[PDB]
Symmetry: C3
Subunit: 317 residues, 3 copies
Amino acid sequence: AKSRTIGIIGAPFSKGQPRGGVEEGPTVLRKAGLLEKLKEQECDVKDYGDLPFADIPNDSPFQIVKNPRSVGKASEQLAGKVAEVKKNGRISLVLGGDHSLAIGSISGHARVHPDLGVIWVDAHTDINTPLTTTSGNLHGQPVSFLLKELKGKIPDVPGFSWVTPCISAKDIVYIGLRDVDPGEHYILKTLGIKYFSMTEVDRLGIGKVMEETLSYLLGRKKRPIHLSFDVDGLDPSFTPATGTPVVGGLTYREGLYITEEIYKTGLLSGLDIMEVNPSLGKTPEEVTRTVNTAVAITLACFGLAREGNHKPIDYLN
Amino acid sequence: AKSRTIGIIGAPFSKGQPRGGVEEGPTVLRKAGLLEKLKEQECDVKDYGDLPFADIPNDSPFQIVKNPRSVGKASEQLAGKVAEVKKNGRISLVLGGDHSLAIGSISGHARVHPDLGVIWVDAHTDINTPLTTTSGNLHGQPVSFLLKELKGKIPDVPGFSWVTPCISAKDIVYIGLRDVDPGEHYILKTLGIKYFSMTEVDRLGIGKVMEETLSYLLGRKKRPIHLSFDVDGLDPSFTPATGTPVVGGLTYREGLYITEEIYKTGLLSGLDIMEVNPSLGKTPEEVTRTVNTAVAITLACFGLAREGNHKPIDYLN
Amino acid sequence: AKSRTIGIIGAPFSKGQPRGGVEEGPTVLRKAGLLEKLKEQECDVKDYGDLPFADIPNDSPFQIVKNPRSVGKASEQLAGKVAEVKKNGRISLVLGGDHSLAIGSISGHARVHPDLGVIWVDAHTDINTPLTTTSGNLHGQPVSFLLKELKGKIPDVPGFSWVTPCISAKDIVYIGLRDVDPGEHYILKTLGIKYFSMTEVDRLGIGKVMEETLSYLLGRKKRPIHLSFDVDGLDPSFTPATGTPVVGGLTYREGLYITEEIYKTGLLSGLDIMEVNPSLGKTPEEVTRTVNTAVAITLACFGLAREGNHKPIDYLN
Ligand SMILES: CCc1nn(CC)c(C2CCN(C[C@H]3CN(CC4(C(=O)O)CCCC4)C[C@@H]3c3cccc(F)c3)CC2)c1CC
Ligand SMILES: CCc1nn(CC)c(C2CCN(C[C@H]3CN(CC4(C(=O)O)CCCC4)C[C@@H]3c3cccc(F)c3)CC2)c1CC
Ligand SMILES: CCc1nn(CC)c(C2CCN(C[C@H]3CN(CC4(C(=O)O)CCCC4)C[C@@H]3c3cccc(F)c3)CC2)c1CC
Ligand SMILES: [Mn+2]
Ligand SMILES: [Mn+2]
Ligand SMILES: [Mn+2]
Ligand SMILES: [Mn+2]
Ligand SMILES: [Mn+2]
Ligand SMILES: [Mn+2]
């Protein structure tokens, strides 16, 4: 089954954001029994392991932008693993780690199937450039490096030598937005990027959001799709354990309809479950809750449906 | 009126599942003044009573199915009293208890009104047969015994000799589904049954779920509606005190929107308020919350409109 | 932008209801940083201070209606300040306080912009007369005092000597209602008032709720809109520290979309955030959650979008 054949790349990286603990994301997500869960849900799973990041001493900030040589090397080494997975014939699955690893994820994937479309589930567009960036964090700057349109506006940041924009503006849709920087709104609006903030979902409902999202992305031909889900795109009552929570976002049901719908397209070929920090929870249940939501979102992507699932065998005999 | 004339049945029985305290559902709902409140909403109310359940010594299982004679005679006791209430020109209001009681509830109702239409608001389909069951719980098997299409596909289980199936596959709608077993999903597809799982609610909104449902059950002509309401159909953040709770489901608002709509037709003729377990509270407020949600649902079945209610008199006089 | 020039008036008035603490509403709304967050949002924020509401001891009640002289005095004082703000080209931002002050705000707004249409976002209709009312609390009687059609159904009550009904029973739309008295529902129907109870918000989504609200009042002409908002309209899970909390109301995201589509018109002239009682939250966090949501409600009515908000400059320079 193509839609059930997966390559599990675990990326324990955190130098893209200023809070420790997001590196233990792969670990906690694996302890919840996702490998076995996907295997009990008729899946062809194979684990590639955690990618190691041999510490980079001497990594002075590029202006205000912190940890550039580390953010880059981790994405360039992951980009090699995603390409190596896609060649083995499997849907790449990147467990983060911080969302700056999306540069590597989309990059390696795009090396095999350059015609990819991107659905981005996040509260923040994460579309900042090292010049527009207000915080300096590279986890909120992945999208600027990947757009063919922003070249010339993207400066020479140490560690990003390898980067060649692989996605054009027309090939990425936003869902769940509610925390956008002024500079990010300029990029969103002036580039003409198909966005659906929380206002959009409140007006149409996730049904019409996915109706327009899969038509906008797959209108002409059925090309492969890369889903870059940052768990802060959901409401902090479902994913409380995360670096940047913003209240009033996607509900548990909403997160399941997005993933259940993209599965039915039969074109999911890359997935990212980013920004899961297990040591950023106010109580143990906020941690369990977060991982249970991130694991449920994952199973919805690879076959799980709420109406039920059955095999081609007679159950009434 | 024929919509506010009620026959209050109590059903203190829990032997349909492995978690005790659900036999204390008819007690607690009555403590929270369910009857006092209905008479205020201008309801002609009668109390038939909380049914006494004959204690079967040594209830040997039928294969992996636990307590078959107890469920078999408790539902047979209900059927006789449901037929009585329905024949006394009254709308049955069963207070459970577990869902295995829907055998006698629907059977009793179809003796007076054989053209009955069933709306099942519940997280589970409960359509397992005594062979396709895996949990062995009889609260997950009613719809199978009740269905005519499964004749020959149900074995001789002790206590169900009196059982004459009375519903057709096209005489039932599902609303809330999210925890389905392969065998249960299989029968739903191979029997052409109309199901609205959480995916369908997330897609179409509770307005179109209630739109599609009523135009479907009352197609060619007007007929009587039997709403079997399990409080787990709603999210366990509104109904925690329940046996098999599943996260991210029907809201306290959607559950009300469904019930308000069946009242507006004036054809609700059979009601089941199932799976209320006050012994499954984790703070006395979660029982108080589950029981408040149960009374809000029922009051809405008899005209408790959220837009307002008034007597047919001049109020500016 | 004229939908950015603001005038702040803070009513520490609480004698319109039994629960004490609603008088500290504008002070807690000032510590949170209302003016500061608006100035960032590019607003012309000029404070008009706090109103000096004198004590009226021995204020005898009129029938079941308590503190009538004090309420009429408070709104008469507010009608004159709201008028000065309206005459200076500023949006009247009134910070309550209880919902009785909506007599003074809407009258003060009708003295300058008399062709205004109202949107009552509440959990209750607030349309009780000094006779029909069952509580005798004036924070639930403002609308009927302002209706021209109910000229003759309001008796001579001490303090409201100045009152002349300014709005018609057609220049108003209700939203989020789920606790409407029999007398309140009688007025709503035998007057034909546009309403969006919680039943319609569940039926048509908040998107079609706003197309139907905004068309019903802004069809023929681009007329001034006054939003008399009560935090009890939003579910007690979002604004819990309020006097009359009603479960199953508007969410954070529905209350944000409402205020977002109202800014988009550019016809907002008045705004009233009412009933934030900081002494009515079980935990200190419940107080914070009621206030943060009120701030989020206000800021959305003056430009704050979820998609982003940039200035008219080139972010790539
Ligand atoms: C509930 C609603 C709400 N309540 N509040 C707080 C009262 C907000 C605010 C939450 C925070 N944003 C500021 C941060 C939003 N940006 C996001 C990111 C980036 O581009 O760097 C970082 C995460 C990924 C993308 C970075 C920026 C920042 C952060 C640190 C330093 C700095 F100079 C600027 C302001 C609004 C909201 C959302 C409207
Ligand atoms: C992400 C949410 C989630 N997390 N998990 C846990 C990883 C679940 C699971 C919850 C349970 N279902 C299966 C049980 C639910 N079935 C239904 C019922 C029946 O007919 O017996 C029982 C309730 C009424 C109808 C019986 C079955 C069962 C139960 C016990 C033993 C047995 F062998 C089979 C598996 C998934 C979910 C819901 C999707
Ligand atoms: C689902 C939760 C629920 N559980 N219950 C209890 C079974 C209710 C009821 C709660 C109370 N309402 C009536 C009160 C609501 N009114 C409106 C207001 C007013 O006029 O003062 C309140 C604030 C502004 C508008 C005044 C009235 C009142 C109040 C005091 C005394 C008196 F005699 C009547 C009936 C339903 C609900 C709401 C469905
Ligand atoms: Mn992100
Ligand atoms: Mn994010
Ligand atoms: Mn059930
Ligand atoms: Mn169930
Ligand atoms: Mn009010
Ligand atoms: Mn109110």
